[PDB]
């Protein structure tokens, strides 16, 4: 008769989410879907506890970066037959980088749910009252460091950059300067590079030097993008996962494509439902999994929310996308999709990540040098990952 299935998901806060569900089961008059959100910091944490203590949801959101760590456990139901029998469900119709995401080891194990990248937002009532051109899409690394600097005002707590320095952000920043993570086929790490050593040191001597980005003591108790909000940042590198936020930001604001310095590098991100490989409502949650993926009308919700993109890459789907401001330059996104450099797929991404920030954390906080934390990094990761 009536089923029930439970969806544990982070990247919606609920709005566009709860009117993709009202959709859903207005289709699916026998399926109920039962949503529980926790905040991204503490989900996958979250996750893998209601996992391995045998209450998995039976749909659940992964990113890009932890699936492998996922698929490899075996948590995940194979949809390989779900997805041959949704006779109409067609992912020659998707962005192919984002449901290739979620296969491993030749089979599908995620329905891609939506894509994203990360830009630099800028403040333009900062840079007008500064007298300082706007970002371009041709800026180097010296070009933001030059304005940030001249939009820094350190007596009214105004910051002229601000970007994580993090694992994740990092993997981009060092393909900037023409540097890697991993080898080609993941048995070295070369994170520990001279390459390296200079893309990290761009980004902790804005915090530690030329005090043009907030520190971590600046931000105890806060996000950037709540500084961003106060008008205390004129640049910052987020993702358009936040555009939804910023639209009643008290100023005027943009987007362009991050600068690079030997070459442009930016994120491309996904997430992806999963099926718990013991749920007895499996058909339910793919079900929904492929509304989530596929459907239409969910897609147009998740446009008109500007709730990162979905799977589908139709125009007319995505024009009303393009359309929408703030912020203007909406075309900085799909621009940026060119120089995208994709996650490392490692299964002990969170777990290596965890080790990096705190290494990279000492350098901002005045414990470390960028060299030491590269080479602590590089030392863990061959330590974790076995490497010869
Ligand atoms: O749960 C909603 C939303 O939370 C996070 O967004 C806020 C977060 O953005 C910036 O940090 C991110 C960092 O978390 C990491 O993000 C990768 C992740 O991005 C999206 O998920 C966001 C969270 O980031 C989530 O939807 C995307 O959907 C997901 O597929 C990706 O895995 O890495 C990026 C790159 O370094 C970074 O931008 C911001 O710095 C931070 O302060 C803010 O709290």
Redesign the pocket.
């Known amino acids: 008769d009536k089923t029930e299935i439970t969806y544990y998901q982070?990247?919606?806060?609920g709005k566009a989410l709860d009117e993709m569900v009202k959709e859903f089961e207005k289709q699916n008059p026998d399926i109920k879907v039962n949503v529980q959100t926790i905040?991204?910091?503490d989900?996958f944490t979250k996750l893998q506890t209601q996992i391995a203590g045998g209450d998995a949801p039976d749909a659940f959101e992964l990113?890009?970066?932890t699936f492998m760590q996922y698929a490899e456990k075996g948590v995940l139901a194979d949809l390989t037959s779900y997805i041959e029998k949704d006779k109409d469900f067609d992912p020659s119709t998707l962005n192919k980088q984002a449901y290739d995401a979620f296969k491993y080891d030749g089979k599908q194990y995620g329905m891609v749910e939506?894509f994203?990248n990360?830009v630099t937002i800028y403040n333009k009532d900062l840079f007008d009252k500064a007298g300082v051109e706007y970002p371009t899409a041709d800026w180097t690394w010296k070009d933001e460091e030059a304005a940030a600097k001249k939009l820094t005002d350190a007596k009214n707590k105004v910051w002229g950059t601000s970007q994580?320095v993090?694992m994740?952000?990092f993997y981009?920043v060092a393909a900037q300067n023409g540097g890697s993570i991993f080898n080609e086929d993941l048995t070295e790490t070369t994170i520990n590079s001279p390459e390296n050593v200079e893309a990290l040191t761009h980004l902790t001597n804005e915090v530690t030097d030329s005090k043009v980005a907030p520190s971590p003591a600046d931000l105890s108790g806060q996000?950037?993008?709540d500084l961003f909000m106060n008008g205390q940042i004129a640049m910052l590198?987020?993702?358009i996962?936040?555009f939804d936020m910023f639209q009643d930001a008290p100023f005027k604001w943009d987007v362009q494509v991050e600068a690079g310095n030997t070459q442009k590098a930016t994120?491309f991100?996904?997430?992806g439902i999963g099926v718990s490989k013991d749920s007895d409502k499996k058909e339910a949650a793919f079900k929904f999994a492929s509304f989530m993926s596929a459907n239409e009308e969910a897609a147009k919700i998740r446009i008109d929310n500007n709730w990162?993109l979905p799977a589908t890459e139709n125009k007319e789907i995505l024009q009303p996308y393009l359309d929408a401001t703030p912020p203007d330059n909406r075309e900085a996104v799909f621009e940026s999709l060119q120089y995208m450099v994709l996650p490392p797929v490692v299964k002990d991404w969170n777990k290596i990540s965890d080790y990096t920030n705190s290494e990279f954390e000492k350098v901002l906080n005045g414990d470390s040098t960028p060299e030491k934390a590269l080479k602590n990094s590089e030392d863990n990761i061959n330590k974790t990952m076995g490497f010869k």
């Open positions: 982070f990247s919606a806060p905040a991204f910091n989900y990113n890009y970066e939506s994203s990360v994580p993090t994740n952000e981009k996000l950037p993008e590198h987020t993702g996962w936040l994120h991100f996904a997430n990162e």
